[PDB]
Amino acid sequence: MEFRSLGRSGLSVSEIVYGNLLDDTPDEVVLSSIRAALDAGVTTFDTADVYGMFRSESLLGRALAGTPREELVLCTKVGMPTGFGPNGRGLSRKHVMESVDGSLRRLRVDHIDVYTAHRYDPATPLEELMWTFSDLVRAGKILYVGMSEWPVERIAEAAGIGARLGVPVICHMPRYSMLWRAPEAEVIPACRDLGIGQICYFTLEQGVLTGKYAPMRRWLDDDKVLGRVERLRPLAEEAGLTTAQLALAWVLQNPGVSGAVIGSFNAEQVLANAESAGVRLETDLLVRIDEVLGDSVVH
Amino acid sequence: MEFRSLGRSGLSVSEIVYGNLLDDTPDEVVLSSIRAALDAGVTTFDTADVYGMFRSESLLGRALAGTPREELVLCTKVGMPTGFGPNGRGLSRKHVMESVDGSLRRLRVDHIDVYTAHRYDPATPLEELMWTFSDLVRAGKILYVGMSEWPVERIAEAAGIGARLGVPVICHMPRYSMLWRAPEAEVIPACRDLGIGQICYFTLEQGVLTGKYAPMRRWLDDDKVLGRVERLRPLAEEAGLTTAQLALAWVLQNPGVSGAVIGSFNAEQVLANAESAGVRLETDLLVRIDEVLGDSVVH
Amino acid sequence: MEFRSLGRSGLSVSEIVYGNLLDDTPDEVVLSSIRAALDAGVTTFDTADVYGMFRSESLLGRALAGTPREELVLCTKVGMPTGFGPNGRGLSRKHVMESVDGSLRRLRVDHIDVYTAHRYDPATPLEELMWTFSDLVRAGKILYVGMSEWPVERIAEAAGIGARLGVPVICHMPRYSMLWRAPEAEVIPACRDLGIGQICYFTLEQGVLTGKYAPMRRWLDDDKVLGRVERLRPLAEEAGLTTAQLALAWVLQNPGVSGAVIGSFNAEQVLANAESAGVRLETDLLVRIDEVLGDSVVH
Amino acid sequence: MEFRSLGRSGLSVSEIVYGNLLDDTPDEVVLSSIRAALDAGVTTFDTADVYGMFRSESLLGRALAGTPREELVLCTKVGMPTGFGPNGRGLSRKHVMESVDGSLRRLRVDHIDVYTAHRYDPATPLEELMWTFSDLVRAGKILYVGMSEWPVERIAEAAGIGARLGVPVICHMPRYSMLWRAPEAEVIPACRDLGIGQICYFTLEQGVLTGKYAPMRRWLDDDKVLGRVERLRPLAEEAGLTTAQLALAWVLQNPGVSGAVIGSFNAEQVLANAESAGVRLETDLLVRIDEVLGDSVVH
Ligand SMILES: NC(=O)c1ccc[n+]([C@@H]2O[C@H](COP(=O)([O-])OP(=O)(O)OC[C@H]3O[C@@H](n4cnc5c(N)ncnc54)[C@H](OP(=O)(O)O)[C@@H]3O)[C@@H](O)[C@H]2O)c1
Ligand SMILES: NC(=O)c1ccc[n+]([C@@H]2O[C@H](COP(=O)([O-])OP(=O)(O)OC[C@H]3O[C@@H](n4cnc5c(N)ncnc54)[C@H](OP(=O)(O)O)[C@@H]3O)[C@@H](O)[C@H]2O)c1
Ligand SMILES: NC(=O)c1ccc[n+]([C@@H]2O[C@H](COP(=O)([O-])OP(=O)(O)OC[C@H]3O[C@@H](n4cnc5c(N)ncnc54)[C@H](OP(=O)(O)O)[C@@H]3O)[C@@H](O)[C@H]2O)c1
Ligand SMILES: NC(=O)c1ccc[n+]([C@@H]2O[C@H](COP(=O)([O-])OP(=O)(O)OC[C@H]3O[C@@H](n4cnc5c(N)ncnc54)[C@H](OP(=O)(O)O)[C@@H]3O)[C@@H](O)[C@H]2O)c1
Known part of the structure; x- marks a missing residue:
């Protein structure tokens, strides 16, 4: 790795x-997939309180039990509805304080490495949120703070308050892929200046960028994109990669990216996809990818 | 709700x-009234250490036991005499530190949502008080701070220190009703600028604004006000409301108001009074209320 | 009281x-004297780690066991040698951190009300000391900070750092009596500006100001002062006081004084001396005291 | 001492x-050497998490068990690899937070007196490191912070952040001896201005400065230095010292030095070497040492 x-x-x-992320996948398949990730040298695990409604955190806690704590980076989230009523969601001191101990218990740990504000909450002043994170960092319950689906101006505001209060703001989680490049315009450049790295989701666009679909619904209902994806296969095999490994390597060519998230409940896919780590793509190949995909790319 | x-x-x-607030009401009637409030979708409960001398907090703790914590907003107070001698009252670091664990134990909770300084204490420097609140917020024992019966200049001073120390100052508890409008002059406008919402008491003026008394002692000894209140009954029924529901809706028309407190040990009154929540009153009706009440209104 | x-x-x-302060006084006489103080309405108790080497704190803890915590103000000290070697004394983070839990255990309490730096330590930077006090205030182990036998410039420096760090600096303990008035020159005026009150020791000058000695060694070896003290007896009886009660009232006439410390292992003396509390002395009597004592007074 | x-x-x-520092020394010889150090009046013990991989800390904890805590200064380290993977080393919030409880458990103590950043970590922003130390000082787990093998500009940066956050930065651990004087140029003068004292290692240059080797490999492969060291023996005996005691006294003549570290698993060497403490060397002898060693001295 x-x-x-x-x-x-x-x-x-x-x-x-x-x-x-979770649903009717048996626990046993979730557990063996996490195990496959460990075997592939994956150290870093992403989840959320809301995922399978607490089930995702509980299964990760079980699967990683016994792994020395220093070998794991546990990332989880707060902000999505996990209780009833208007205080059972969002980023208030109340919801964050009433969320963190549940996540620690289900993950079976003393501290969360990265704790991500899941969606910006316009009702919570960022002074309220960041002082709550300060209290949790002082208490040793979280180490580092992240954000997902935030306006760039709010990321900047949070990073500034964090620096003043000694709360590390180090992580942003965008949607990012060969097809979805919205974050290249403003998010990644801003984050890089603020000392924030990307941990990217939908990197395989839910399987569309594995080349598996011949002529999610957004691209599946388009035979043009599916045909253009099939044409990356020669480019991939040229580099001794699967289309999946090429799509993952492509995300990792961005120097603003710390990590690419993979989902899969297939041990063989996890091991194969993990081998994308460290792969340099030639300038020539990156120009030929943009040509093949053309106007199917979202900016 | x-x-x-x-x-x-x-x-x-x-x-x-x-x-x-408590007295010879049996526990069983207090408990069933709190239960009626829950059934009406009331999430937010006001009490104080001093109320029935600890009995109010203990009965609320018992009645709300089992309710998921995220569904409740627990408000309690410190400042009124609860022990013997000059350190058994007021807002000193000593009295606040020696008060908070008692309130947590009696309410059966890890944290108080809103903890209200019950009456301004001229002997305690506000730096002493606000640093004590900072220590309790850091410790996770209180989330938010409120005030009751404070001079406006002291509210402003506390809000400023709170912002600097990361202590949320969000709540003020005035006397406010169709008849008592003293807080409209300075308190509510100042509080709104400072980011403080009102949770209002004596909203029914101890039953005077239910229309129940035909021709507390302040208005009961005046047949003029009691006659003028009886004349709100047609205005109320016009809007499909009881006089009680009209009085409660009236308070909630103020955009500086977060909540209206109801007291009642009658299940039917609690359920009926709770239905005031969300009711818009027409501009026409608000002008006709001021006409009927005329000079009985205190400004 | x-x-x-x-x-x-x-x-x-x-x-x-x-x-x-302690020695061959039996425990039983110490305990019954503290009990006499409680019976006289004394709320405020002064001791030190070093006193009878931990015995003073242990006996006070035993005697006050059962008294509601809010009714007591417990004052203790750190700075005097209580362990072996150069880290067993002074005001270092190390010595203070290794001292406070011992004092809490022996006093049988969760927090010390007033914790007094016993003698200024020139080897400890005041930033080191005051940040240690900040950590103990945050932790809820001490409420307020005091000082004894400090240069005035160091009191001022500590009060300034305290205000910045939210550490209340409220107490100074000088030697002060009808005969010893050194603190009137600089200490009391400076302390009053800084918001610090005096808790005064040797107020009876170890029994010299009870009028008991007819014609400590400093004044006992002087028949002039002992004769002048005997002549306060008519002035005292004029006011319906003992010479002891007059000496204690005299200290309390200073508006910079919060309290006068009494030592005594005699129940009758404790009860009699406690009645000094609240006594106003006439301007006439205060001029006649200065005349009788004349040049025996130390300025 | x-x-x-x-x-x-x-x-x-x-x-x-x-x-x-540890290896095939039996535990029993390590334990009796630490005991010899205690018998010689040594209060101050240096170790590291990494030393004999946790064995050094565990043996020190065992040997010092029973010694009153106030009589000991325990120094340990964080920064060297103690776990697998890139978070099992360095000075990140993660590695420091996951290291400190292990060191406390193995040393059998509530707090480390001096906790030394073992080698500067260019990947950790010093704001991240110093806020982690702040959290540990607030929590009472460490008292004072030190550094080893840091660039002088980073020592200065850390000392500045420490002063702002109330983290005492008081200790630097250089290599320093009669032969190795690199720290005299910049490190010691800078440290003295910043209020940092040296605790010096390789003071006997691994036995080369005991005079024991007649005509480590750096000097052992040079018969010139070994001959020049043998010629310090008359100078040492002139002062009633062994060459070992002269080398240790020489380091302690520097007023920027707080302590000189000795290693030895020989009880007699520990007791003899400890007697170097307090020895003044004459100006004449210090000039004759520089003459004998000449150009073998590293500046
Ligand atoms: N922060 C946020 O807002 C946010 C939101 C959503 C998700 N996330 C995170 O990001 C992750 C995204 O996971 P995702 O699965 O939705 O998106 P994805 O990683 O883009 O899609 C992975 C899917 O593609 C298919 N696939 C992958 N490799 C393959 C291979 N070698 N051969 C054939 N098929 C392959 C698999 O489905 P098949 O069963 O079809 O093979 C797999 O489940 C989540 O697990 C979650 O932790 C974060
Ligand atoms: N912060 C402060 O300084 C402060 C001070 C005081 C109180 N408070 C809070 O505010 C609350 C005020 O309670 P309160 O009862 O004194 O004042 P209130 O709410 O103005 O009066 C309520 C009373 O009016 C009567 N009533 C209500 N609805 C009715 C209906 N539909 N039909 C007939 N009668 C009705 C009931 O008494 P009957 O038995 O006559 O029906 C009831 O007890 C307290 O519980 C306390 O939590 C705060
Ligand atoms: N911060 C500091 O540096 C510091 C230093 C020292 C002390 N202190 C504190 O201040 C206190 C001073 O106590 P102290 O006893 O040394 O000084 P003191 O209060 O000036 O002397 C009291 C003594 O005078 C005698 N006495 C008192 N009332 C009497 C009466 N009505 N009739 C006859 N005799 C009477 C008693 O001794 P007989 O047995 O002769 O009757 C009694 O022990 C200590 O307990 C300690 O807590 C503080
Ligand atoms: N902060 C850092 O980066 C760092 C790095 C390394 C070490 N350190 C610390 O500094 C210490 C250095 O220890 P060290 O042993 O490597 O270096 P040292 O103290 O310069 O060397 C001591 C050695 O010299 C010999 N010796 C000492 N006194 C003697 C005498 N009177 N007669 C004969 N031989 C004598 C002994 O070995 P023989 O068996 O040959 O007699 C002894 O083991 C370590 O224990 C560690 O705590 C710190």
């Missing part, structure tokens, strides 16, 4: 991150 | 708040 | 403070 | 410090 700094911090994450 | 932001904060309170 | 503010703080102390 | 201030702090260290 290869490792990157998560923003300007002493924290190293694996370049491939395992995410266990 | 309808919900408002408590000042500029991520905290939502129910627009109707249940207060259990 | 009468009570004063301890400096600019919400803390009230009894005007008469019981000190239990 | 003689004692010095560790930088500008209230902490006193013994002028001779015992270091137990």
Whole structure:
């Protein structure tokens, strides 16, 4: 496995991150997939309180039990509805304080490495949120703070308050892929200046960028993109890669990216996808990828 | 139930708040009244250490036992005499530190949502008080701070120190009703600028604004006000409301108000009064209320 | 009993403070003397780690066991040698951190009300000391900080750092009596500006100001002072006081004084001396005291 | 034993410090050597998490068990690899937070006196490191911070952040001896201005400065230096010292030095070497040492 700094911090994450979003997958298949990720040298695990409604955190806690704590980077989330009523969601001191001990118990740990504000909450002043994170860092319950689906101006505001209060703000989680490049415009450049690295989701666009679908619904209902993806296969085999490994390597060519999240409940896919870590793609190949995909790419 | 932001904060309170001030009401009637409040969708409960001398907090703790913590906003107080001698009252570091664990034990909770300085204490420097609140917020024993019966200049001073020390100052508890409008002059406008919402008491003026008394002693000894209140009954029925529901809706028309406190040991009154939540009153009706009440209104 | 503010703080102390410095006094006589102080309405108790080498703190803890915590102001000290070697004394983070839990255990309490730096330590930077006090205030182990036998410039420096770090600096303990008035020149005026009240020791000058000695060694070896003290007896009886009660009232006439410490292992003396609390002395009597004592007074 | 201030702090260290770096030395010989150090009046013990991989800390904890805590200054380290993967080393919040409880358990103590950043970590922002130390000082797990093998500009940066955050930065651990004087140029002068004292290692240059080797490999492969060391023997006996005692006294003549570390698993050497504490060397002898050693001295 290869490792990157998560923003300007002493924290190293694996370049491939395992995410266990949940649903009718048996527990036993979730557990053996996490085990496959460990066997592939994945250190860094992404989850959320809301995922399978607490089931995702509980299964990760069980699967990683026994792994020395220093070998794991545990990332989880707060912000999505996990209780009833208007205080059972969002980023208030109340919801965050009433969320963190549940996540620690289910993950079976003393501290969360990265704790991500899951969606910006316009009702919570960022002074309220960041002082709550300060209290949790002082208490040793979280080490580092992240954000997902935040306006760039709010990321900047949070990073500034964090620096003043000694709360490390080091992580942003965008949607990012060969097809979805919205974050290249403003998010990644801003994050890089602020000392924040990306941990990227939908990197395989839910299987569309594995080349598996011949002529999610957004691209599946388009035979043009599916045909253009099939034409990356020669480019991939040229580099001794699967289309999946090429799509994952492509994300990791961005120097603003710390890690690429993979989902999969197939042991063989996890091991194969993990081998994307460390792969340099030639300038020539990156120009030929943009040509093949053309106007199917979202900016 | 309808919900408002408590000042500029991520905290939502129910627009109707249940207060259990105590006395010879049997425990069983207190408990069934709190239960009626829960059944009406009341999330937000007001009490104090001093109320029935600890009995109010103990009965609320018992009645709310089993309710998921995230569904409740628990408000309690410190400042009134609860022990013997000059350190058994007021807002000193000593009295606050020696008060908070008693309130947590009696309420059966890890944290108080809103902890209200009950009456301004001229002997305690506000730097002493606010650093004590900072220590309790750091420790996770209180989330948010409120005040009751404070001069406006002291509210402003506390809000400023709070912002610097990361202590949310979000709540003020005035006397406010169709008849008592003293807080409209300075308190509510100042509080709104400072990001503080009102949780209002004596909203029914101890039953005078239910229309129940035909021709507390302040208005009961005046047949003029009692006659003028009886004349709100047609205005109320016009709107499909009881006089009680009209009085409660009237308070909630103020955008500086987060919640209106109801007291009642009658299940039917609690359920009926709770239905005031969310009711818009027409401009026409608000002009006709001021006409009927005329000079009985205190400004 | 009468009570004063301890400096600019919400803390009230009894005007008469019981000190239990120790030695061959049986435990049973120490315990019954503390009990006599409680019976006289004394709330405020002074001791030190070093006193009878931990025995003073242990006996006070035993005697006050069962008294509601809010009714007591416990004052103890750190700085004098209590262990072997150069880290077994002074005001270093190390010695203070290794001292406080011993004092809490022996006093049988969760927090010390007033914790006094016993003698200024030139080897400890005041930033080191005050940040250690900050950590103990945050932790809820001490409420308020005091000082004894400090240069005035160091009191000022400590008060400034305290205000910045949210550490209340409210108490100074000088030697002060009708005969010893050194603190009137600089200490009391400076302390009053800084919001610090005096808790005064040797107020009876070890029995010299009881009028008991007819014609400590400093004044005992002078028949002039002993004769002048005997001549305060008519002035005292004029005011319906013992010479002891007059000496204690005299200290309490200073508005910079919060409390006067009494030592005594005699129940009758404790009860009699406690009645000094609240006594106003006429301007006429204060001029006649200075005349009788004349040049025996130390300035 | 003689004692010095560790930088500008209230902490006193013994002028001779015992270091137990580990290997096939039986436990019983390590334990009896630490015991010999205690018998010689050594209070101050240096170790590291990494030393004999946790064995050094465990053996020190066992040997010092029963010694009153106030009589000991325990120094340990973090930064060297103690776990697998890139988060099992360095100075990140993660590695420091996951290291400190292990060191406390193995040393059998509530707090480490001096906790030394073992080698500067270019991947960890010093704001991240110093806020982690702040959290540990607030929590009472460490008292004072030190550094080893740091660039002088980073020492200065850390000392500045420490002063702002109330983290005492008082200790630097250089290689320093009669032969190795690199730290005289910049490190010691800078440290003295910043209020940091030296605790020095390789003071006997691994036995080369005992005079024991007649005509480590750096000097052992040079018969010139070994011959020049043998010629310090008359100078040493002139002063009633062994060559070992002269080498240790020489380091302690520097006023920027708080302590000199000795390693030895020989009880007789420990007791003899400890007697170097407090020895003044004449100006004449210090000029004759520089003459004998000449150009073998590294600046
Ligand atoms: N922060 C946020 O807002 C946020 C939101 C959503 C998700 N996330 C995180 O990001 C992750 C995204 O996971 P995702 O699965 O939705 O998106 P994805 O990683 O883009 O899609 C992975 C899917 O593609 C298919 N696939 C992968 N490798 C393959 C191979 N070698 N051969 C054939 N098929 C392959 C698999 O489905 P088949 O069963 O079809 O093979 C697999 O489940 C989540 O686990 C979660 O942790 C974060
Ligand atoms: N912060 C402060 O300084 C402060 C001070 C005081 C109180 N408070 C809080 O505010 C609350 C005020 O309670 P309160 O009862 O004194 O004042 P209130 O709410 O103005 O009066 C309520 C009373 O009016 C009567 N009533 C209500 N609805 C009725 C209906 N539909 N039909 C007939 N009668 C009805 C009931 O008494 P009957 O038995 O006559 O029906 C009831 O007890 C307290 O519980 C406390 O939590 C705060
Ligand atoms: N911060 C500091 O540096 C410091 C230093 C020293 C002490 N202190 C504190 O201050 C206190 C001073 O106590 P102290 O006893 O040394 O000084 P003191 O209070 O000036 O002397 C009291 C003594 O005078 C005698 N006495 C008192 N009332 C009497 C009466 N009505 N009739 C006859 N005799 C009477 C008693 O001794 P007989 O047995 O002769 O009657 C009694 O022990 C200590 O307990 C300690 O807590 C503080
Ligand atoms: N901060 C850092 O980076 C760092 C790095 C390394 C070490 N350190 C610390 O500093 C210490 C250095 O220890 P060290 O032993 O490597 O270096 P040292 O103290 O320069 O060497 C001591 C050695 O010299 C010999 N010796 C000492 N006194 C003697 C005498 N009177 N007669 C004969 N031989 C004598 C002994 O070995 P024989 O068996 O040959 O007699 C002894 O083991 C360590 O224990 C560690 O705690 C710190």
